[PDB]
Structure 1
């Protein structure tokens, strides 16, 4: 048994999952988020209590208002960087794609549905048919090139076009459609099969900008996705990681990563199961 599997069992048999989560909540460093609280930025925030820190927020270069609810999560020991953002609002979809272009982002990971429990969690920021989606405020257009519908997720091939310079770029849109809000995936196998499909696409490689991970608020399910992938990269280096400390370090870049104790427990399960690294996952996932 590994040092992660022994801690997992002790946390399970002793029922210490919620106190561990409360420890992470209390040990979380608070940082200034003044730009997010400006009066001009009220219509750019989906939730009042979810704001990006000033020191790590992503800036929209050369725009009149450079604010977007997006945080750059840097893990130097892992050579990995993610942009965790909220589900775009109808008026910030143009800022979302300007950010994707400026940061040279290759992949967009979506872990939420457009509609969840009688509420819209994210605007339809990519086209569903062959019609062009225009974003004139930032001068961008998005076309749906191809889509691959699996059982519990869909991969869209999107063409992001700079309508001013004519330059186009292909974007891989991974849409996890069966991850409930404030909940966990069906199994560690279905999540790891999705995470490794993102890895196998080369869109997390250093030849690209940071991938954009987003759900509804960009801290709950997005934090669970980011913590597992970061830990799986750190353990490949040969480090005996402390999952609690890796999460608290990530929480210095964006507040409230991982929202429920069950999401934290699932992170331990996915890290333990993913540590053994796959074809088994694809079959257990039942994506076909």
Structure 2
């Protein structure tokens, strides 16, 4: 990246703070314990997520306790089912309207019966990127995510939507990059390009062995303009790994944009949790945020 003097100074300032915290890990543990003490109560989730908890929609939730708030859920409009209130388990995550800072749609891994819903959301919200932080199935053979994207059996269809894979590339850091095209079957308007990035080495309720692959996702997305549209980020529930990734991406972009408040990662995670329950699930994930932010600021200032 080409940085201004102001951006380079801010990266150095942020690096001293974040590296100071990893050198004093009790400070980071106290922050996460404080976040856990300030968690929302069950009635605050349930009474403010009325559409997700509706009988028509409960089977559209992978996890009964991970649902979007009514205030910032993504609504399918138009929607095939006129009684569903446009429901998809998906949350708009943002810290501002700056066009220098990405907004995210944090969502669950699609279920077989919500895959048309997922791809209609991609088109309606014109999302240019999908970041997928799960395998389809874990090493216990528990299904974590529906296969909404693989085409080896033949080109994929979801109701009126057609999906094509133009190419698949892998990286030395284990990322899989798929160039996807999505369009309606019965239209003359052009297809929509989506870059799908899958990282299969981030365990559920866990952390990767190192920060290199997660920072490579951020490095590949630095030059994607936020104004193109929200970045979809999902794992299985769309809160633990998803929240962790969004916190790393958001914090680095905010430092580069001159937002001093990015140095308060606990405040960032608190704001994420006000937009989707339980974003950043574990203390190891919170430490991973710090380690990835430090490592990326070291690269930015190298």
User: Could you tell me the TM-score, scaled by structure 2's length?
Assistant: 0.84
What residue number does 1:49 align with? 65
Return the alpha-carbon distance in structure 2 between the equivalents of residues 2 and 258 of structure 1: 23
Q: Contact (CA 8 Å) 2:235, 2:242: kept in 1 or not? A: yes
2:170 maps to 149
Q: How does 1:183-194 map to 2 (within 5 A)?
A: 183-194=206-217
SS of corresponding position for 1:113? coil
Matched, 1:9 2:61: no
The answer for unaligned runs of 5 or more in structure 2 is: 1-14
**1:128 corresponds to 2:151:** yes
Matches within 5 A, 1:126-275: 126-129=149-152, 131-136=154-159, 139-151=160-172, 152-167=174-189, 168-200=191-223, 202=224, 205-240=225-260, 241-275=263-297
Q: TM-score, normalised by structure 1?
A: 0.88
Aligned residues: 271
1:24 counterpart = 2:35: yes
Deviation at 1:206, TM superposition (A): 2.9
What SS does structure 2 have at the residue aligned with 1:75? coil
Listed one character per residue, the Cα deviations across residues 150-201 of structure 1 (whole Å, up to 9, x for unaligned) are 241100011101113243111100011111111112212232122212334x
Q: Which consecutive segments of 4 or more residues in structure 1 shift more than 4 A?
A: 16-19
Further displaced range: 31-40 or 94-103: 31-40
Alignment correspondent of 1:40: 56
Q: More deviation in 170-179 or 148-157?
A: 148-157
CA RMSD of aligned residues (A): 1.9
Gap regions ≥5 residues in structure 1: 281-288
Any idea what SS the aligned residue of 2:74 has? coil
- Cα distance, 1:77 vs structure 2: 6.6
